[PDB]
């Protein structure tokens with residue numbers, strides 16, 4: 001639980017590393033924009049201020065979403081259950 | 095349940111207060127636009143009519159999403175289960 | 189189950205009726221655009237091809253999302269479980 | 283489980299085939315853009331770089347979302363549980 005959250009954290013980090021490199025290189029975004037876009041994509045926000053322009057970028061984004069969404073939201077949840085909720089409940093009492 | 099919903103309500107309010115101040119100040123949005131954007135972000139709608147323009151805004155938005163999504167949707171759900179569904183079911187019968 | 193799906197269906201319909209009237213009137217959208225926008229909003233797609241321009245539209249959209257998201261996705265799910273999955277499984281065998 | 287994932291995979295594929303043909307034809311998108319848009323829609327990302335322009339496209343998109351969202355996310359999850367998580371856990375040990 002405290003130990004499992006560390007697994008999803010690495011996996012998420014690795015997923016975002018992959019998107020940051022792909023979109024910097026193929027779509028030509030600055031690395032910070034590429035990471036931002038990767039996060040905005042896999043959390044399903046999708047502002048569209050960055051969006052792939054090339055057919056290679058679109059095909060990767062299809063695959064990137066299907067693979068990553070399940071992971072990322074897995075991490076958000078465990079962060080919610082096993083890391084966020086404790087601190088909350090511990091602040092309720094002295 | 096009636097008591098827990100009040101916890102998530104405050105926490106959500108505090109999360110949206112934080113986004114409203116950050117985006118008003120760093121991204122220069124009117125306070126109402128900043129709150130609207132914060133809500134549109136953390137519910138994962140993401141119209142993109144407002145989107146951060148500065149690197150500081152993008153880095154904060156990455157962190158803001160990961161922290162807040164789990165909270166907000168937690169509140170939507172409890173609102174659904176413990177506050178919305180009762181009124182519905184009570185209207186079914188006299 | 190077959191009976192409960194009918195409840196969420198009406199409630200969803202009523203939620204979308206409300207958005208269709210509000211956005212037609214306050215934001216000035218054609219009624220079909222207003223319904224489309226209401227659906228695109230409460231399912232959290234959020235293309236942003238329509239987005240509220242007035243402060244009244246933004247305040248309503250904040251409230252509309254928090255109230256409706258929980259409902260709508262409730263209906264999508266029951267449609268998935270109690271109406272979509274049966275037909276699927278019945279087609280598996282003669 | 284290994285067998286059920288194959289069911290959702292076909293159904294998802296068929297759902298995306300339908301969107302690819304509809305949006306190519308009615309909205310006039312290149313087939314690759316149409317598939318990309320279908321995926322970006324049903325995963326609720328919604329960049330809005332493509333969005334339907336015709337009333338027929340908007341009405342279909344309303345129905346397409348309500349029908350498909352439940353399916354697609356069903357597939358993402360099973361992919362997460364029954365296909366993604368194993369490989370993860372098997373890499374943990376030799």
Ligand SMILES: [K+]
Pocket residue numbers: 047048049141142143235236237329330331
């Ligand atoms: K946009």
Ligand SMILES: [K+]
Pocket residue numbers: none
């Ligand atoms: K735009």
Ligand SMILES: [Tl+]
Pocket residue numbers: 047048049141142143145236
């Ligand atoms: Tl945008």
Ligand SMILES: [Tl+]
Pocket residue numbers: 049050
């Ligand atoms: Tl941009």
Ligand SMILES: [Tl+]
Pocket residue numbers: 043044045137138139231232233325326327
């Ligand atoms: Tl979304």
Ligand SMILES: [Tl+]
Pocket residue numbers: 044045046047048138139140141142232233234235236326327328329330
């Ligand atoms: Tl979006």
Ligand SMILES: [Tl+]
Pocket residue numbers: 141142143235236237239330
């Ligand atoms: Tl937009």
Ligand SMILES: [Tl+]
Pocket residue numbers: 143144
């Ligand atoms: Tl704006």
Ligand SMILES: [Tl+]
Pocket residue numbers: 046047048140141142234235236328329330
């Ligand atoms: Tl958008």
Ligand SMILES: [Tl+]
Pocket residue numbers: 048235236237329330331333
């Ligand atoms: Tl747009």
Ligand SMILES: [Tl+]
Pocket residue numbers: 237238
């Ligand atoms: Tl428009």
Ligand SMILES: [Tl+]
Pocket residue numbers: 044045046138139140232233234326327328
């Ligand atoms: Tl979205």
Ligand SMILES: [Tl+]
Pocket residue numbers: 047048049051142329330331
């Ligand atoms: Tl866009």
Ligand SMILES: [Tl+]
Pocket residue numbers: 331332
């Ligand atoms: Tl386009």
